[PDB]
Design a protein around this nucleic acid. Structure first.
Lengths: 96, 120
DNA sequence: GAAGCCACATCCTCTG
DNA sequence: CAGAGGATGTGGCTTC
């Protein structure tokens, strides 16, 4: 599905969780779906590096992620410093 | 504002543009005119008609007749028509008896409104 | 290939 | 100040 040919966020963001060598900027937080945010403005930077969008910041990338709520991809861990989580039991009806 | 003909010559409505994007603040809000004397207080709803998906999703779709001129705070078109395809939107006036004017080729509902096309 | 999609980019606003 | 959110252009990508 169109995640294959053209690069995504959630498809991209999890090139950095799974890879041990990028924990400089992120990490899995616990057994259940969660994720921490190391440098809030080095993260956005590399998403600029891929998207060819040098003006990129957190505010920009972040908004894109907050769309995901209404579509049931991922969701927010309330009041936690820059931490959301993935909905997989829905990613598979969204790739059914 | 500017008006256009109908399939009931007793009522008229706004010039809704050729082609627009899914769910925008309309460039000109929707006026619906009563030439025949209508009790100012009667309700008016619209239903987007098309051989494909004969009932599309709409918002602020119901409005109230006032001074023989029913206006829609801001109507918005969500449910898409398709490629090259427009809506024959139906227009209901809740009275005794209620009356409708069909309206063919009203507006084309796509993802992009017609942006000046690509520069590649 | 313009015409419909798509999934961010960018943006300026509130309100928790 | 972060975070949810409307509006609106943008660029890549299937479909006629």
């Amino acid at each position: 599905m169109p995640g294959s040919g053209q690069i995504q966020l959630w498809q991209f963001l999890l090139e950095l969780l799974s890879d041990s060598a990028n924990a400089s900027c992120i990490t899995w937080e616990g057994t259940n779906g969660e994720f921490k945010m190391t440098d809030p403005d080095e993260v956005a930077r590399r998403w600029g590096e891929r998207k060819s969008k040098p003006n990129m910041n957190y505010d920009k990338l972040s908004r894109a992620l907050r769309y995901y709520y209404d579509k049931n991809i991922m969701t927010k861990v309330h009041g936690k410093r820059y931490a959301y989580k993935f909905d997989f039991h829905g990613i598979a009806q969204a790739l059914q | 504002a500017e008006l256009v003909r109908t399939d009931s010559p007793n009522f008229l409505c706004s010039v809704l543009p050729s082609h627009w994007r899914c769910n925008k603040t309309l460039p000109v809000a929707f006026k619906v005119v009563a030439l025949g004397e209508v009790p100012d207080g009667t309700v008016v709803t619209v239903m987007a008609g098309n051989d494909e998906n004969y009932s599309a999703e709409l918002r602020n779709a119901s409005a109230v007749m006032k001074n023989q001129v029913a206006r829609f705070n801001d109507l918005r078109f969500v449910g898409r028509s398709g490629r090259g395809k427009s809506f024959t939107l139906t227009i209901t006036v809740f009275t005794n008896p209620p009356q409708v004017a069909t309206y063919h080729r009203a507006i084309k509902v796509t993802v992009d409104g017609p942006r000046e096309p690509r520069r590649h």
